[PDB]
Design a protein around this nucleic acid. Structure first.
Ligand SMILES: [Mg+2]
Ligand SMILES: [Mg+2]
Ligand SMILES: [Mg+2]
Lengths: 318, 106, 67, 206, 143, 141, 223
RNA sequence: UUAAUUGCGAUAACGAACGAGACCUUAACCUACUAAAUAGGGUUGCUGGCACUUGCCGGUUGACUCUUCUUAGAGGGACUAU
């Protein structure tokens, strides 16, 4: 239960529609970008004062269609955005100019992810294909793993110094999530588990505990480094996003009903975040697409369909 | 021993647009394989040829009118090349319906 | 006068029958799914079908519907 | 207060009448409030406009036409008759002239005067032709705000046009006079007279 | 800073030009002035009789300054318009052919207009200077 | 090398390329400045966007417009649109985004098209009619 | 040689039309259907399709050569610059023009009209078209003009699935008692059509779903 | 209800077809793609006109790169969306 509770300390809004994803760099907590269905990207610089926690610092007339998956480099200078328009754009954040268009995909690019060295980008599209790009703009590797639809791709950082392999995880629609390495250059394992169909796979801040989310009502977490099945945590609703804490061992889950908070090691069902809206009956209630922390571990951002980002500041009760 | 740059225009005119496009693509591919400096498949104002007519053979009904139109597609493909290479290219590079025409010289 | 035609409605119904999972409420994803699974010789028609499917999905959240 | 200058030179007067106040053609759009209950919103004001001309589409749905500026409406109505079809520029010029004339006339906000005129000439209850067999019997009926407003707008313009045929008194002046008559309700203008007649007709069926 | 030439509100510039011409007395009058309709779509010549041709010349010069290679036909087209055709609707017929030519010749003589290659007319350098001076004067009048 | 954008302005058939660079504060149209334009009455329309955000947002940004198509009114409107776009574009690119958002808000609460382009174009004037819809004259007499 | 491009194209079209007409007239016995002009530098290929290809050919260079000569005479070009090939049409049943010609031939020789139409329809169906229609307008016993519609399957009358889908053939048939007119519209099957869309634009067909088994323990499968 | 035998429902009818729709060309949106001394726009040569200081305004196919506008091509985009 604890004493540190979640209270809203600001609502951020600038996008004129759905916000599909948001991300923060490991180096800089101040800059958190936000990608929208409104063809656009808006970077937030964080100031903490009163209500305006983060104001628009760099907006972009980026892609033509939807900025659907956004991943920024660990340093915070290359911002790589994906789209349904089959392309991916690399962004210089301080200036506000594009660098390289990664043109190769036959369908809509559903996931972008950046390497630990910020060099070997990896993209997956609704195609059956998972391409590997360079920051220059070169196709390196076309991964054929999933027999149906690929949706999410995430990279796990490594500590125990440098064993060789670079660890990737890819969500599917065949009911099998796949594990990749880049150097044994390809497959590591097949992590079967999900009952419904997979949405969001989120790895641990250490880079081993990867939670896979679905539509059924249970999150299935895996231990990647030792190649084993960890636990199945309860959710009840359809899951849209996951957010692992840099602060402690918290998991924050975006569900169909609202937001549900859990922990990694201790099987607890802590707090439910459900904000108040204008109008609405019951089933119409807007639920967040994607949610992300920062690096401080004090703040949570959640991109709602209703345009909203909601800054929950985790602070002590007494 | 030769290699004297003339700069050669290729005309691509026709009606059936798809075929024309295919031809253009083929030409560009061929240029790539022979590796030359070239300006692209430059497109001109696709001229419509309108002929509007009384639908009636004989002028006894309501005044129905039909615009019979002819879509035309004019394409310039500019090559920085000698003549021999152009000749080589134009040995094949002909597909039915589409007009292949070589202007030659700058 | 934007009443969806018989055909579109029928197609939507068929889609719902055969693929009630993989119809994620919002338009865009659903549209793409429709394009993938159902073979439509058009684009506008496909879009219309997608829209109708989304509507059906919305309805089916708030109870059971006839057929 | 404070004339900030640029490379391309703008005259001083224009600079003076710019940022500090959300103005009109040259003077205040601000103030000018509806004296009469009802007809507010449906006689525009509210949203500040700087010219009496927009491309702004309004004939799109229904109640959108009752969000079009009053000056603009007047100008549009002026465009009646074939010799004057289109030619919004001319109409706007006429309106400007009318406004100037109103300003000249014992000071006061010209916009306010215009509003008053619009209010006054609008008929309250009007007869509509009812069948009831065959004979042209009329039964009197309440008139919706928007329709009233429209009628009022029409009437003044009609009066002006009537005046303007064979007259040194250029249309603008006539329009101004009409407005004055409406505002200072003396029943000497066309519009007011017509309204009165309509009311009489209604009475003779009520 | 910079003294501008295009930035003059049209008519004032023309007036200034006319005044300058009047002051100089150097133009050489066409001779067919006032005994002419000037436009093919005219029932009246210029209203003020003497002058107005000067204004026309000034306007022509301004147009020349604005553009590149400009000729007689274009000038004619410019100074044409709508014909009162009675029962028949209006057409578009151009200005008087010789008068414009004469004006151009006069300008050339003074040194405002120079002959351009490819086909047309441009501005002489002395002429350009004069134009600039006129513009400056106009600005002074305004300021 | 200068921070600059090239913006279009579009109404009916009128198109207006405004070029937004950085300098003293020059706003020109076809060589002549922003003042003249000369339908004369419609002058204040082109002044509107400038007025909205103020003279302050121009002492830095220079605007140079080239306009084709349309007539006079349409051309004016196009120019206006172009100018509105240009400033916004500049703000989006180089200046802070808050300012841009504020500008947008100002424009959208006063939406005389501007950042939203004009919608209508003429219906084609089909046969049996002197106009688009307007027919000749049926005469059952 | 050489005019305005548009003009040139127009002229070419006109030439093609003329040629088609000539072939309809000249090669009537030969069972002609379509012309396929290919204009290249020097050698202009002219492909001609017919039912009775042998007749067109002659006895090695008979009629075809004559036709070539005629063409040359018509349009100023020399010997060798125009080449003519006669080919078998890939199933005449889908081809409307050929069918129309056949019908005309049947009429002219002396046969039952209605029965002939039915036979034609049957043949078309056998060939593999989605449907077809024959219309026979004129005097079919008695003075008053009678239309006679005969059909099989669907017949799409409206939409762009006509210029892409239905081969139409109109012919006049000359008779001693009065002129007949035979119209024939043929519904080619979407799949075999190849050019344009491969199915009818209104139609939507969805595939069968594939079964997946959930749970069965999460488990780990390693390499 | 619909522009519609357009649909929902009631219902010895059920599921169908043509016609309406869909389709097709065009008109609209793309500061994302494809390229343009036959569409354009930039920086500097040569100089033309100035204010006379750096800066303006030009013309000139000089050179260079871009493609917003122009053009089409490929797609996308609105489904009454929320
Ligand atoms: Mg007249
Ligand atoms: Mg149909
Ligand atoms: Mg139709």
């Amino acid at each position: 239960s604890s004493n540190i509770m979640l209270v809203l300390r600001g609502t951020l809004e600038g996008h004129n529609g759905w916000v599909t994803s948001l991300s923060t760099s490991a180096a800089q907590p101040n800059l958190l970008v936000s990608g929208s269905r409104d063809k656009t990207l808006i970077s937030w610089r964080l100031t903490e004062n009163e209500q305006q926690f983060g104001v628009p610092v760099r907006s972009y007339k980026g892609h033509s269609h939807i900025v659907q998956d956004v991943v920024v480099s660990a340093d915070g200078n290359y911002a790589v955005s994906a789209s349904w328009d089959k392309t991916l754009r690399l962004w210089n954040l301080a200036t506000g100019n594009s660098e390289a268009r990664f043109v190769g995909h036959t369908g809509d690019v559903l996931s972008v992810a950046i390497d630990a060295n910020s060099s070997k980008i990896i993209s997956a599209s609704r195609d059956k294909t998972i391409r590997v790009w360079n920051t220059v703009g070169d196709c390196a590797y076309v991964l054929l793993g999933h027999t149906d639809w690929v949706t999410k791709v995430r990279v796990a950082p490594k500590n125990l110094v440098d064993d060789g392999r670079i660890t990737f995880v890819s969500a599917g629609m065949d009911k099998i999530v796949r594990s990749w390495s880049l150097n044994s250059y390809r497959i590591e394992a097949d992590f079967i588990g999900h009952n419904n169909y997979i949405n969001v796979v989120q790895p641990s801040p250490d880079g081993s505990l990867a939670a896979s989310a679905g539509k059924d009502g249970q999150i299935y977490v895996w231990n990647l480094k030792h190649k084993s099945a960890f636990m199945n945590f309860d959710a009840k609703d359809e899951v849209f996003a996951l957010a692992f804490s840099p602060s402690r061992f918290w998991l924050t889950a975006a569900t169909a009903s609202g937001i549900k908070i859990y922990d990694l090691e201790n099987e607890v069902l802590i707090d439910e975040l459900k904000p108040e809206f204008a109008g609405y009956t019951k089933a119409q209630d807007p639920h967040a697409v994607s949610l992300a922390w920062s690096a401080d571990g004090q703040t949570l951002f959640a991109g709602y369909t209703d345009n909203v980002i909601r800054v929950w500041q985790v602070m002590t009760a007494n | 021993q030769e290699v004297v740059i003339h700069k050669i225009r290729i005309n691509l005119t026709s009606t059936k647009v798809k075929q024309l496009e295919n031809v253009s693509a083929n030409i560009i591919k061929n240029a790539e394989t022979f590796k030359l400096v070239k300006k692209g498949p430059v497109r001109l104002p696709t001229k419509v040829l309108k002929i509007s007519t009384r639908k009636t053979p004989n002028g006894e009904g309501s005044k129905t009118w039909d615009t019979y139109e002819m879509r035309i597609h004019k394409r310039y493909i500019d090559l920085e090349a000698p003549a021999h290479i152009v000749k080589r290219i134009t040995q094949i590079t002909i597909e039915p319906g589409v007009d292949v025409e070589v202007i030659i010289a700058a | 006068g934007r009443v969806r035609t018989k055909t579109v409605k029928r197609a939507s119904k068929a889609l719902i029958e055969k693929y009630y999972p993989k119809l994620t409420m919002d338009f865009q994803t659903n549209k793409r799914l429709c394009d993938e699974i159902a073979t439509i010789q058009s684009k506008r028609l496909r879009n219309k079908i997608a829209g109708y499917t989304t509507h059906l999905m919305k309805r089916i959240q708030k109870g059971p519907v006839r057929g | 207060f404070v004339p900030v200058e640029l490379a391309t030179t703008i005259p001083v007067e224009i600079q003076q009448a710019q940022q500090e106040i959300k103005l009109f053609n040259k003077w205040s759009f601000e103030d000018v409030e509806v004296k009469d209950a009802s007809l507010v919103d449906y006689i525009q004001i509210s949203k500040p406009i700087y010219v009496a001309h927009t491309a702004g589409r309004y004939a799109n749905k229904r109640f959108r036409k009752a969000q079009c500026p009053i000056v603009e409406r007047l100008t549009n109505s002026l465009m009646m008759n074939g010799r004057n079809n289109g030619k919004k520029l001319k109409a706007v010029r006429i309106v400007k002239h009318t406004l100037e004339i109103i300003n000249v006339l014992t000071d006061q906000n010209p916009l306010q005067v215009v509003v008053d005129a619009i209010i006054n000439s609008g008929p309250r209850e009007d007869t509509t032709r009812v069948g009831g067999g065959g004979a042209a019997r009329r039964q009197a009926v309440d008139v919706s705000p928007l329709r009233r407003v429209n009628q009022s707008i029409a009437l003044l313009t009609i009066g002006a046009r009537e005046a303007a045929f064979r007259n040194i008194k250029t249309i603008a002046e006539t329009l101004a006079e009409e407005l004055i008559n409406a505002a200072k309700g003396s029943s000497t203008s066309y519009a007011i007279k017509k309204k009165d007649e309509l009311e009489r007709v209604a009475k003779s069926n009520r | 800073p910079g003294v501008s030439v295009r930035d003059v509100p049209a008519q004032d510039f023309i007036n200034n030009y006319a005044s300058f011409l009047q002051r100089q007395g150097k133009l050489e009058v066409p001779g067919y002035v006032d005994i002419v309709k000037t436009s093919a779509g005219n029932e009246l010549p210029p209203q003020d009789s003497e002058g107005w041709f000067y204004k026309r010349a000034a306007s022509v010069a301004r147009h020349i300054y604005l553009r590149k290679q400009v000729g007689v036909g274009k000038l004619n087209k410019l100074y044409g318009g709508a014909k009162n055709r009675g029962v028949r609707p209006h057409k578009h017929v151009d200005a008087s052919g010789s008068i414009n030519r004469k004006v151009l010749q006069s300008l050339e003589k003074l040194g405002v207009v120079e002959i351009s290659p490819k086909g047309g007319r441009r501005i002489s350098d002395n002429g350009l200077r004069d134009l600039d001076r006129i513009a400056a004067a106009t600005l002074e009048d305004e300021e | 090398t200068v921070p600059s954008v090239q913006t279009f302005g579009k109404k009916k058939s009128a198109t207006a390329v405004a070029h937004v660079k950085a300098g003293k504060g020059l706003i020109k149209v076809n060589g002549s400045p922003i003042t003249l334009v000369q339908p004369e009455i419609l002058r204040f329309k082109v002044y509107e966007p400038l007025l909205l955000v103020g003279l302050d947002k121009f002492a830095n940004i220079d605007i140079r417009v080239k306009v084709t198509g349309g007539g006079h009114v349409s051309q004016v409107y196009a120019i206006r649109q172009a100018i509105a776009k240009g400033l916004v574009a500049y703000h989006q690119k180089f200046v802070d985004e808050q300012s841009k958002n504020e500008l947008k808000k100002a424009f959208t609460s006063y939406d005389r098209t501007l950042l939203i382009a004009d919608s209508r174009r003429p219906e084609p004037k089909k046969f049996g009619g002197r106009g688009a819809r307007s027919r000749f004259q049926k005469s059952y007499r | 040689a050489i005019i305005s491009k548009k003009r040139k194209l127009v002229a070419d079209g006109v030439f093609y039309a003329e040629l088609n007409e000539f072939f309809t007239r000249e090669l009537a016995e030969e069972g002609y259907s379509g012309v396929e002009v290919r204009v290249t530098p020097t050698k202009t290929e002219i492909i001609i399709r017919a039912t009775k290809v042998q007749d067109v050919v002659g006895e090695n260079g008979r009629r075809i050569n004559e036709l070539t000569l005629l063409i040359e005479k018509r349009f100023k070009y020399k010997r060798g610059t125009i080449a003519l090939y006669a080919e078998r049409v890939h199933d005449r049943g889908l081809s409307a023009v050929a069918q129309a010609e056949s019908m005309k031939f049947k009429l002219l020789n002396g046969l039952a009209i209605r029965r002939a139409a039915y036979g034609v329809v049957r043949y078309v169906m056998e060939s593999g078209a989605k449907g077809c229609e024959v219309v026979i307008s004129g005097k079919l016993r008695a003075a008053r003009a009678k239309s006679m519609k005969f059909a099989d399957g669907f017949l799409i009358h409206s939409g762009q699935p006509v210029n892409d889908f239905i081969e139409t053939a109109t012919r006049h048939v000359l008779l001693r008692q009065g002129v007949l007119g035979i119209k024939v519209k043929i519904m080619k099957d979407p799949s075999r059509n190849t050019s344009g869309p491969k199915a009818l634009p209104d139609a939507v067909t969805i595939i069968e779903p594939k079964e997946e088994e959930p749970v069965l323990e999460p488990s780990v499968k390693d390499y």
